[PDB]
Amino acid sequence: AKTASDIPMIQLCAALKCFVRGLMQNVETQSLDEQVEHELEKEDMDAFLRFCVENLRRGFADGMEVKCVMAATESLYQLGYTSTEFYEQVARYLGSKCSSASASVNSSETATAVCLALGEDILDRHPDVHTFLLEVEKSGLKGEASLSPTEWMNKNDPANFITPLTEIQQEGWNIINRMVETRAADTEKLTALANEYVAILKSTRVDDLKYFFGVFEE
Amino acid sequence: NPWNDGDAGWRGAATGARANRGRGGFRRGRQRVQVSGLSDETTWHTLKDHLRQAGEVTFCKVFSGGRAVVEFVTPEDAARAITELQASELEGATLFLREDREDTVLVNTRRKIREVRDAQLRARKEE
Amino acid sequence: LEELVEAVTLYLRATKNPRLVSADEEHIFFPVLMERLNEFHVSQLLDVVECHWARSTLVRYGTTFKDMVRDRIALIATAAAKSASDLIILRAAEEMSPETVLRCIIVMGMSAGRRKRDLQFFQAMGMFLVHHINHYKDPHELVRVLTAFARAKIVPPKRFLALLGRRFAVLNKRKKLGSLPSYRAFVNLYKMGHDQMNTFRFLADCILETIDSNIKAEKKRLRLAQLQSDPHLLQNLRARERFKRLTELKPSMFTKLLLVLARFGAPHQQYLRPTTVPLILPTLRAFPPPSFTRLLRAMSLFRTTDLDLIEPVIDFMADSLGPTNVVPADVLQMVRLVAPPDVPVPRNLVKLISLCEAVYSSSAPGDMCAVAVVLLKIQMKDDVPLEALDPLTRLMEFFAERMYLLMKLHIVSLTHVDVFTDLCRQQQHPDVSGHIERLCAERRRVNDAEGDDEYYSQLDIDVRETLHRILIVNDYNTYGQYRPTPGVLQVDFKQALTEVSAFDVLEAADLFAQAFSNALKPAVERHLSRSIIAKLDGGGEEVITEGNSIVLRPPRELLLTREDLGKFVCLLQRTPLRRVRASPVVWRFVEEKAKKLGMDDVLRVVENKLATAV
């Protein structure tokens, strides 16, 4: 919560998905004294969630992709932010971009989850959003909820240089940094290096190809 | 500021939303005019483009509400700009120009004309 | 060796009654101690040094004893360091126990200072304490070390302080550090220029943790109770007791901890905000005015973008106090704080605008231009209600009237005039009373005909510097004699008087009263009266020396002319200083001067005044 200024929205969604997966399991409560502890943890969680929803509102104002706000709203529902005054803003922004946003390029399970999380009165207040959610739950990506948070972040934000490179991924950058300073006329050397590079393409990150093409123009 | 103590933070981090600005190409394989009345959407690029019609610019910065500060290259780039680009039209944001005739150096320049004249005034009062 | 050690303490414990300070027993015992200083152990000498002192006894024997034990412990420490590279010396290494070193640090903080000997002395066994750092157990001992080191005013090896700060958290696990010791450490590490941040962060979080734990315990008690199923002082006592019970500190010092935290630029979303509802809001009224003003000043730096605290402050300021119970500076700061776009428009902004109008309507110099800037920023700030926009135009008209009269007085600089003209031009304010164009025409006539420097010379500037000094001195706020005026301003203003003559100081008083009549503060008034009495008496003045002492200045003389005396009479006619209006010394001085020059009518007038003042 501290030092979280100028936060790209994908970072916030990854953090929220990380937090939801480390929650304690509910057990029968001894009502003598632990109810007070429950109130204290409720107050602290509210003190955190208020800052989170403030940042989400700033993102709303500045414009953001429907997938990220979708996932963030689902995650905040997972944490019990049951206020319904922010969910109307959620529905308003989602219906604002409902015309052109792609339907089958989203997670269907997330669609079902957010449709459940959004109130039925809020739903039939926005029949277009209702229909869009049903369409996404019919045709959409499957199994995206089971991925680890770092996998989700890597598969929705290319590059981003946060997680360290694997051992295999370092070989591609060795090849590229070796190709950079090679003389242009040495065609055989470049051919050999590229034929070595293409062998490990399946493991290299997709974004780094931007460099592989660029040196080709160089 | 002291609480940052050199921490770059998310502004200086390597997030995927930061490499988007980097439209370079990914090739190599890794005295000052105060101008008011502009629009907040008006980029500094458009600012340089408009006011370089008068003279060259080293630094320029916008502020909320259209206020902005521009530093010139040479005094001639200023002496022309102080009076030429007044009330010119750009993007529906007709500019209004003011010039800080007093400078952080020119104040010390005015100190001596203040004090010697004060000595003259004191001599007058004594007489 | 214990007999004499016990005897000196037996004599010393009674050194409070003047007769019980037995000089005979002092001469009987203490010289033997000075001859037997080597005999006793380190702990015995330190324990003797610890005890209470009579100042006559201290100057007789203790002052030497300080250094005569300092050097002995220095040699013992030298032997110990040689081990780490007289019978007691041969066993010196085991004498410097960590507790022994700790007490050696502690027992010095009543006679040391910025002296070089004290500096090197304390910089000697600091490394011994570093050699024993891991063996210290109780966290409060290190806080005591810090405050003793602060008492001696030493120049610390900042890295060593940072190491101690880091180990504070190591020791904090065993026993939680108190809120008062933590703030003690905070103010220490502030006042010897520590700049490591993290040490400050740990103490701030510890204080917040204590407050949070106290509040949570109180809420637990109230919840468990649920599970079972003048009058202003009367109200303020409960707030003060709740505050003291919760944070263990005064508001006058909490409001400075918040000030320093705002100065650091810490994120207010998790420092200022978590304590607003359970702590800050209910106790707000009990705040002393010097603390409420500092709270607002810290708010300005924090730039808190939340109305959940801002609005109740607006309500309390608007209703519970009124126009004449709030400083105009505080309301100006409050309206400035709501200017930034980060803060949305409060739902009670109309009350703030109404009180803002009232305070400056009842306030009838160069800062008001900035006020216009503030208005400039608020006029496009979202959907401002119209009834809040109406008073602002009349307010600007009142400002324009005041500046126009000031130009007729030739006081405020024309640069601020040009700034004001630019502001009213860009604000597109339609003049109704015709004052804006009057100001523009007057500024043209002044600047473009005679000159800005020529305008500055309308009133001679050696008087004007004293006038600015008077203004900045009067800028102090007291909230009704709550804070007496500090003596530093009195000192510099007195030295300013010591150079200027008498006639032009009264000219400065008249010029000040022409626009701020009766606004001169009583301390400045009485000091001016004293200086004028001394000047017209001609005895001399108090010249300040290096050691905060005084020397009588050589006698003064003032050979004023008849016209100068007439202008002095006019000044007396218009001056508000009662003391100079009633003191007979000024009248006899005027009579003597008039006799020296010679005029019948003014002489008769001065005699008539003297008959009513002798």
Tab-separated table of N, CA, C and O in Angstrom, chain C residues 290-388:
chain	number	residue	atom	x	y	z
C	290	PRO	N	-2.027	27.706	18.784
C	290	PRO	CA	-0.717	27.463	18.157
C	290	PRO	C	-0.554	26.055	17.621
C	290	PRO	O	0.272	25.847	16.725
C	291	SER	N	-1.307	25.085	18.133
C	291	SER	CA	-1.269	23.730	17.602
C	291	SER	C	-2.237	23.517	16.449
C	291	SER	O	-1.910	22.789	15.508
C	292	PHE	N	-3.417	24.140	16.496
C	292	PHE	CA	-4.343	24.056	15.372
C	292	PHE	C	-3.747	24.706	14.128
C	292	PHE	O	-3.867	24.175	13.013
C	293	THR	N	-3.088	25.855	14.303
C	293	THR	CA	-2.443	26.515	13.174
C	293	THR	C	-1.345	25.644	12.579
C	293	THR	O	-1.208	25.552	11.353
C	294	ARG	N	-0.551	24.990	13.430
C	294	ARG	CA	0.484	24.099	12.923
C	294	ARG	C	-0.113	22.879	12.238
C	294	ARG	O	0.455	22.384	11.259
C	295	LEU	N	-1.244	22.377	12.734
C	295	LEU	CA	-1.914	21.275	12.056
C	295	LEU	C	-2.327	21.682	10.650
C	295	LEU	O	-2.124	20.932	9.690
C	296	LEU	N	-2.895	22.883	10.507
C	296	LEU	CA	-3.256	23.364	9.173
C	296	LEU	C	-2.022	23.544	8.293
C	296	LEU	O	-2.047	23.231	7.094
C	297	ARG	N	-0.932	24.054	8.871
C	297	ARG	CA	0.297	24.231	8.106
C	297	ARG	C	0.823	22.896	7.594
C	297	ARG	O	1.288	22.798	6.454
C	298	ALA	N	0.758	21.855	8.427
C	298	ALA	CA	1.155	20.525	7.981
C	298	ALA	C	0.193	19.974	6.938
C	298	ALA	O	0.617	19.259	6.024
C	299	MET	N	-1.099	20.286	7.059
C	299	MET	CA	-2.042	19.908	6.012
C	299	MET	C	-1.644	20.496	4.670
C	299	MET	O	-1.744	19.825	3.636
C	300	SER	N	-1.208	21.755	4.666
C	300	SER	CA	-0.852	22.395	3.401
C	300	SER	C	0.265	21.634	2.698
C	300	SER	O	0.216	21.432	1.479
C	301	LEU	N	1.277	21.199	3.451
C	301	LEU	CA	2.368	20.434	2.858
C	301	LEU	C	1.917	19.033	2.461
C	301	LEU	O	2.337	18.513	1.422
C	302	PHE	N	1.069	18.403	3.278
C	302	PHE	CA	0.614	17.055	2.956
C	302	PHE	C	-0.258	17.032	1.707
C	302	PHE	O	-0.240	16.044	0.965
C	303	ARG	N	-1.019	18.101	1.460
C	303	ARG	CA	-1.911	18.190	0.303
C	303	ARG	C	-2.891	17.018	0.274
C	303	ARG	O	-3.052	16.333	-0.739
C	304	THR	N	-3.544	16.783	1.408
C	304	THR	CA	-4.459	15.654	1.520
C	304	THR	C	-5.667	15.847	0.611
C	304	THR	O	-6.390	16.843	0.715
C	305	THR	N	-5.866	14.905	-0.303
C	305	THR	CA	-6.981	14.945	-1.249
C	305	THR	C	-8.175	14.145	-0.743
C	305	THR	O	-8.700	13.274	-1.436
C	306	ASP	N	-8.628	14.432	0.474
C	306	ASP	CA	-9.791	13.756	1.036
C	306	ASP	C	-10.660	14.766	1.765
C	306	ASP	O	-10.158	15.550	2.575
C	307	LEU	N	-11.958	14.742	1.477
C	307	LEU	CA	-12.911	15.619	2.140
C	307	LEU	C	-13.383	15.079	3.481
C	307	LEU	O	-13.930	15.848	4.278
C	308	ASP	N	-13.159	13.789	3.755
C	308	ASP	CA	-13.659	13.189	4.986
C	308	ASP	C	-13.080	13.865	6.219
C	308	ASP	O	-13.701	13.849	7.286
C	309	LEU	N	-11.894	14.458	6.099
C	309	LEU	CA	-11.357	15.294	7.159
C	309	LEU	C	-11.525	16.773	6.872
C	309	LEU	O	-11.748	17.548	7.804
C	310	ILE	N	-11.433	17.175	5.603
C	310	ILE	CA	-11.433	18.595	5.257
C	310	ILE	C	-12.760	19.240	5.637
C	310	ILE	O	-12.798	20.340	6.201
C	311	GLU	N	-13.869	18.565	5.335
C	311	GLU	CA	-15.182	19.161	5.573
C	311	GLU	C	-15.452	19.451	7.046
C	311	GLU	O	-15.861	20.583	7.360
C	312	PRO	N	-15.249	18.519	7.988
C	312	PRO	CA	-15.478	18.870	9.399
C	312	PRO	C	-14.624	20.027	9.873
C	312	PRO	O	-15.073	20.810	10.718
C	313	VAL	N	-13.407	20.166	9.345
C	313	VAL	CA	-12.593	21.330	9.679
C	313	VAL	C	-13.277	22.603	9.206
C	313	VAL	O	-13.305	23.613	9.920
C	314	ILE	N	-13.852	22.575	8.000
C	314	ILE	CA	-14.547	23.752	7.481
C	314	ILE	C	-15.737	24.099	8.365
C	314	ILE	O	-15.962	25.267	8.702
C	315	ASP	N	-16.522	23.088	8.755
C	315	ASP	CA	-17.671	23.348	9.620
C	315	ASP	C	-17.243	23.935	10.960
C	315	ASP	O	-17.820	24.928	11.425
C	316	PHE	N	-16.232	23.337	11.594
C	316	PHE	CA	-15.776	23.829	12.890
C	316	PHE	C	-15.246	25.251	12.775
C	316	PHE	O	-15.501	26.089	13.648
C	317	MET	N	-14.505	25.539	11.706
C	317	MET	CA	-13.955	26.874	11.518
C	317	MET	C	-15.049	27.894	11.241
C	317	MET	O	-14.946	29.047	11.673
C	318	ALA	N	-16.100	27.492	10.525
C	318	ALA	CA	-17.167	28.417	10.164
C	318	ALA	C	-18.082	28.730	11.342
C	318	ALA	O	-18.454	29.890	11.548
C	319	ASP	N	-18.456	27.718	12.125
C	319	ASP	CA	-19.495	27.893	13.132
C	319	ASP	C	-18.947	28.121	14.536
C	319	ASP	O	-19.302	29.109	15.186
C	320	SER	N	-18.087	27.225	15.019
C	320	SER	CA	-17.700	27.225	16.424
C	320	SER	C	-16.838	28.415	16.822
C	320	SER	O	-16.682	28.663	18.023
C	321	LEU	N	-16.277	29.155	15.869
C	321	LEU	CA	-15.350	30.232	16.189
C	321	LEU	C	-15.891	31.606	15.814
C	321	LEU	O	-15.996	32.483	16.675
C	322	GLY	N	-16.253	31.819	14.552
C	322	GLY	CA	-16.730	33.110	14.115
C	322	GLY	C	-15.647	33.941	13.457
C	322	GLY	O	-14.502	33.503	13.301
C	323	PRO	N	-15.992	35.168	13.055
C	323	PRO	CA	-15.021	35.978	12.300
C	323	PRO	C	-13.870	36.501	13.141
C	323	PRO	O	-12.720	36.474	12.685
C	324	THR	N	-14.137	36.979	14.354
C	324	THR	CA	-13.108	37.618	15.165
C	324	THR	C	-12.353	36.646	16.059
C	324	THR	O	-11.487	37.079	16.825
C	325	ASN	N	-12.653	35.350	15.986
C	325	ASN	CA	-11.950	34.344	16.769
C	325	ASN	C	-11.022	33.484	15.922
C	325	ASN	O	-10.522	32.464	16.407
C	326	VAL	N	-10.785	33.863	14.667
C	326	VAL	CA	-9.886	33.139	13.778
C	326	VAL	C	-8.917	34.129	13.151
C	326	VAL	O	-9.315	35.222	12.731
C	327	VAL	N	-7.648	33.751	13.095
C	327	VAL	CA	-6.648	34.577	12.410
C	327	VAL	C	-6.938	34.574	10.914
C	327	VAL	O	-7.299	33.518	10.361
C	328	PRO	N	-6.819	35.710	10.222
C	328	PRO	CA	-6.986	35.697	8.760
C	328	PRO	C	-5.989	34.802	8.045
C	328	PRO	O	-6.310	34.269	6.975
C	329	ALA	N	-4.789	34.623	8.598
C	329	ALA	CA	-3.812	33.740	7.972
C	329	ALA	C	-4.328	32.309	7.906
C	329	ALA	O	-4.121	31.615	6.905
C	330	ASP	N	-4.999	31.850	8.963
C	330	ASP	CA	-5.515	30.486	8.973
C	330	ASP	C	-6.582	30.285	7.904
C	330	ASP	O	-6.580	29.268	7.200
C	331	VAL	N	-7.501	31.242	7.758
C	331	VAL	CA	-8.531	31.089	6.735
C	331	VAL	C	-7.925	31.199	5.340
C	331	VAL	O	-8.364	30.507	4.411
C	332	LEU	N	-6.910	32.051	5.165
C	332	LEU	CA	-6.228	32.124	3.877
C	332	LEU	C	-5.558	30.800	3.541
C	332	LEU	O	-5.636	30.323	2.403
C	333	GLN	N	-4.905	30.184	4.525
C	333	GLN	CA	-4.294	28.882	4.302
C	333	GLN	C	-5.346	27.830	3.980
C	333	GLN	O	-5.124	26.963	3.126
C	334	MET	N	-6.496	27.888	4.654
C	334	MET	CA	-7.542	26.904	4.398
C	334	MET	C	-8.094	27.032	2.984
C	334	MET	O	-8.301	26.024	2.300
C	335	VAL	N	-8.345	28.261	2.525
C	335	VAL	CA	-8.858	28.422	1.166
C	335	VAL	C	-7.783	28.046	0.150
C	335	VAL	O	-8.083	27.486	-0.911
C	336	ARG	N	-6.516	28.330	0.461
C	336	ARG	CA	-5.433	27.909	-0.421
C	336	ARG	C	-5.374	26.394	-0.539
C	336	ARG	O	-5.116	25.855	-1.621
C	337	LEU	N	-5.608	25.686	0.568
C	337	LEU	CA	-5.508	24.233	0.566
C	337	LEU	C	-6.596	23.571	-0.271
C	337	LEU	O	-6.385	22.462	-0.772
C	338	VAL	N	-7.751	24.223	-0.441
C	338	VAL	CA	-8.831	23.652	-1.241
C	338	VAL	C	-8.724	24.034	-2.711
C	338	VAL	O	-9.491	23.522	-3.539
C	339	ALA	N	-7.787	24.906	-3.064
C	339	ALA	CA	-7.551	25.325	-4.441
C	339	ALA	C	-7.109	24.195	-5.374
C	339	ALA	O	-7.628	24.111	-6.494
C	340	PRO	N	-6.169	23.326	-4.989
C	340	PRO	CA	-5.612	22.362	-5.957
C	340	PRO	C	-6.683	21.469	-6.553
C	340	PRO	O	-7.651	21.094	-5.874
C	341	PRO	N	-6.542	21.108	-7.833
C	341	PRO	CA	-7.560	20.270	-8.483
C	341	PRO	C	-7.668	18.875	-7.901
C	341	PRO	O	-8.686	18.210	-8.126
C	342	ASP	N	-6.652	18.407	-7.174
C	342	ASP	CA	-6.720	17.071	-6.593
C	342	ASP	C	-7.855	16.956	-5.588
C	342	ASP	O	-8.407	15.866	-5.398
C	343	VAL	N	-8.222	18.057	-4.944
C	343	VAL	CA	-9.271	18.074	-3.930
C	343	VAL	C	-10.569	18.509	-4.600
C	343	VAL	O	-10.638	19.638	-5.109
C	344	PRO	N	-11.599	17.669	-4.629
C	344	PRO	CA	-12.886	18.090	-5.197
C	344	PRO	C	-13.521	19.197	-4.368
C	344	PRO	O	-13.068	19.547	-3.276
C	345	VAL	N	-14.592	19.754	-4.913
C	345	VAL	CA	-15.265	20.886	-4.265
C	345	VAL	C	-15.994	20.394	-3.019
C	345	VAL	O	-16.807	19.456	-3.111
C	346	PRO	N	-15.744	20.977	-1.849
C	346	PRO	CA	-16.489	20.574	-0.652
C	346	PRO	C	-17.956	20.952	-0.755
C	346	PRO	O	-18.330	21.928	-1.410
C	347	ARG	N	-18.796	20.158	-0.088
C	347	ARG	CA	-20.227	20.430	-0.089
C	347	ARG	C	-20.591	21.639	0.762
C	347	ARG	O	-21.712	22.146	0.648
C	348	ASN	N	-19.677	22.114	1.607
C	348	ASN	CA	-19.913	23.276	2.453
C	348	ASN	C	-18.981	24.434	2.110
C	348	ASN	O	-18.603	25.216	2.985
C	349	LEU	N	-18.601	24.551	0.836
C	349	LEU	CA	-17.698	25.622	0.426
C	349	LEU	C	-18.318	26.996	0.640
C	349	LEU	O	-17.594	27.977	0.845
C	350	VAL	N	-19.650	27.087	0.600
C	350	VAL	CA	-20.312	28.380	0.750
C	350	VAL	C	-20.036	28.968	2.129
C	350	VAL	O	-19.846	30.182	2.274
C	351	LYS	N	-19.998	28.122	3.161
C	351	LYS	CA	-19.672	28.600	4.501
C	351	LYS	C	-18.257	29.163	4.547
C	351	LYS	O	-18.009	30.218	5.146
C	352	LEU	N	-17.312	28.460	3.918
C	352	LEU	CA	-15.936	28.941	3.888
C	352	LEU	C	-15.841	30.268	3.156
C	352	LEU	O	-15.128	31.174	3.596
C	353	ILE	N	-16.558	30.409	2.041
C	353	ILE	CA	-16.531	31.665	1.298
C	353	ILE	C	-17.146	32.789	2.121
C	353	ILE	O	-16.659	33.925	2.105
C	354	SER	N	-18.224	32.496	2.850
C	354	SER	CA	-18.867	33.520	3.669
C	354	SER	C	-17.933	34.011	4.769
C	354	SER	O	-17.749	35.222	4.952
C	355	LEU	N	-17.328	33.082	5.512
C	355	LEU	CA	-16.373	33.486	6.540
C	355	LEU	C	-15.133	34.144	5.947
C	355	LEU	O	-14.572	35.051	6.571
C	356	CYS	N	-14.705	33.714	4.759
C	356	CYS	CA	-13.593	34.359	4.071
C	356	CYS	C	-13.919	35.806	3.740
C	356	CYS	O	-13.078	36.696	3.907
C	357	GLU	N	-15.135	36.060	3.261
C	357	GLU	CA	-15.564	37.434	3.035
C	357	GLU	C	-15.568	38.219	4.338
C	357	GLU	O	-15.059	39.345	4.395
C	358	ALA	N	-16.117	37.624	5.400
C	358	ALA	CA	-16.283	38.345	6.658
C	358	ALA	C	-14.943	38.730	7.273
C	358	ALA	O	-14.785	39.853	7.772
C	359	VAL	N	-13.966	37.819	7.252
C	359	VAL	CA	-12.714	38.067	7.964
C	359	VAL	C	-11.964	39.243	7.347
C	359	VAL	O	-11.477	40.127	8.061
C	360	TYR	N	-11.861	39.283	6.016
C	360	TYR	CA	-11.181	40.405	5.383
C	360	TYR	C	-12.055	41.648	5.278
C	360	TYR	O	-11.517	42.745	5.102
C	361	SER	N	-13.380	41.514	5.381
C	361	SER	CA	-14.211	42.706	5.503
C	361	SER	C	-13.979	43.389	6.842
C	361	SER	O	-13.947	44.623	6.925
C	362	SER	N	-13.809	42.601	7.904
C	362	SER	CA	-13.483	43.146	9.213
C	362	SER	C	-12.005	43.479	9.365
C	362	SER	O	-11.625	44.087	10.372
C	363	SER	N	-11.169	43.105	8.398
C	363	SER	CA	-9.733	43.343	8.459
C	363	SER	C	-9.333	44.696	7.885
C	363	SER	O	-8.136	44.996	7.818
C	364	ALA	N	-10.297	45.511	7.466
C	364	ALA	CA	-10.007	46.825	6.904
C	364	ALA	C	-9.389	47.751	7.947
C	364	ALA	O	-8.681	48.699	7.607
C	365	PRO	N	-0.102	43.032	3.395
C	365	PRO	CA	-0.319	44.141	2.461
C	365	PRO	C	-0.075	43.750	1.004
C	365	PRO	O	-0.904	44.047	0.143
C	366	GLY	N	1.050	43.096	0.735
C	366	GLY	CA	1.362	42.660	-0.611
C	366	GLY	C	0.965	41.222	-0.870
C	366	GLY	O	1.049	40.740	-2.004
C	367	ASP	N	0.529	40.523	0.180
C	367	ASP	CA	0.127	39.131	0.029
C	367	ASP	C	-1.231	38.984	-0.644
C	367	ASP	O	-1.513	37.922	-1.212
C	368	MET	N	-2.070	40.021	-0.601
C	368	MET	CA	-3.416	39.920	-1.153
C	368	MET	C	-3.416	39.631	-2.646
C	368	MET	O	-4.363	39.009	-3.140
C	369	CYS	N	-2.377	40.054	-3.372
C	369	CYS	CA	-2.257	39.669	-4.773
C	369	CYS	C	-2.265	38.155	-4.918
C	369	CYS	O	-2.993	37.606	-5.756
C	370	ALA	N	-1.481	37.461	-4.087
C	370	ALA	CA	-1.528	36.005	-4.071
C	370	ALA	C	-2.932	35.500	-3.779
C	370	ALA	O	-3.366	34.502	-4.369
C	371	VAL	N	-3.662	36.186	-2.895
C	371	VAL	CA	-5.051	35.818	-2.640
C	371	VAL	C	-5.848	35.854	-3.935
C	371	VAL	O	-6.621	34.933	-4.230
C	372	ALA	N	-5.649	36.900	-4.741
C	372	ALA	CA	-6.293	36.948	-6.049
C	372	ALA	C	-5.926	35.722	-6.871
C	372	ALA	O	-6.800	35.086	-7.474
C	373	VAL	N	-4.642	35.348	-6.863
C	373	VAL	CA	-4.218	34.131	-7.547
C	373	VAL	C	-5.029	32.949	-7.043
C	373	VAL	O	-5.534	32.140	-7.833
C	374	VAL	N	-5.193	32.853	-5.722
C	374	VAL	CA	-6.004	31.784	-5.150
C	374	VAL	C	-7.400	31.814	-5.748
C	374	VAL	O	-7.906	30.793	-6.232
C	375	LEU	N	-8.020	32.996	-5.780
C	375	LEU	CA	-9.331	33.104	-6.404
C	375	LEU	C	-9.252	32.708	-7.868
C	375	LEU	O	-10.116	31.978	-8.371
C	376	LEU	N	-8.196	33.150	-8.554
C	376	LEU	CA	-8.008	32.772	-9.948
C	376	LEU	C	-8.039	31.261	-10.100
C	376	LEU	O	-8.606	30.738	-11.065
C	377	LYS	N	-7.462	30.538	-9.140
C	377	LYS	CA	-7.415	29.088	-9.273
C	377	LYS	C	-8.765	28.460	-8.954
C	377	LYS	O	-9.106	27.403	-9.494
C	378	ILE	N	-9.556	29.101	-8.091
C	378	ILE	CA	-10.805	28.485	-7.660
C	378	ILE	C	-11.951	28.777	-8.622
C	378	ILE	O	-12.974	28.082	-8.581
C	379	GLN	N	-11.809	29.773	-9.501
C	379	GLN	CA	-12.954	30.205	-10.296
C	379	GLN	C	-13.271	29.231	-11.428
C	379	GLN	O	-14.433	29.132	-11.838
C	380	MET	N	-12.277	28.509	-11.949
C	380	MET	CA	-12.558	27.452	-12.913
C	380	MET	C	-12.517	26.063	-12.292
C	380	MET	O	-12.603	25.071	-13.022
C	381	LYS	N	-12.393	25.964	-10.970
C	381	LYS	CA	-12.313	24.662	-10.322
C	381	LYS	C	-13.671	23.975	-10.309
C	381	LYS	O	-14.447	24.139	-9.363
C	382	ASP	N	-13.956	23.202	-11.358
C	382	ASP	CA	-15.187	22.426	-11.465
C	382	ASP	C	-16.419	23.319	-11.388
C	382	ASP	O	-16.347	24.518	-11.681
C	383	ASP	N	-17.555	22.742	-10.992
C	383	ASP	CA	-18.830	23.459	-10.963
C	383	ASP	C	-18.970	24.180	-9.625
C	383	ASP	O	-19.595	23.700	-8.677
C	384	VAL	N	-18.373	25.362	-9.558
C	384	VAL	CA	-18.478	26.188	-8.350
C	384	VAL	C	-19.896	26.740	-8.242
C	384	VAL	O	-20.435	27.252	-9.239
C	385	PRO	N	-20.541	26.648	-7.080
C	385	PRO	CA	-21.862	27.269	-6.919
C	385	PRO	C	-21.794	28.780	-7.098
C	385	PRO	O	-20.807	29.425	-6.736
C	386	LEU	N	-22.865	29.341	-7.666
C	386	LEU	CA	-22.886	30.769	-7.971
C	386	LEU	C	-22.893	31.619	-6.706
C	386	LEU	O	-22.241	32.670	-6.658
C	387	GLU	N	-23.640	31.201	-5.681
C	387	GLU	CA	-23.693	31.985	-4.452
C	387	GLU	C	-22.347	32.015	-3.742
C	387	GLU	O	-22.122	32.893	-2.903
C	388	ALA	N	-21.457	31.071	-4.049
C	388	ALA	CA	-20.075	31.171	-3.604
C	388	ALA	C	-19.249	32.077	-4.503
C	388	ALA	O	-18.247	32.638	-4.045
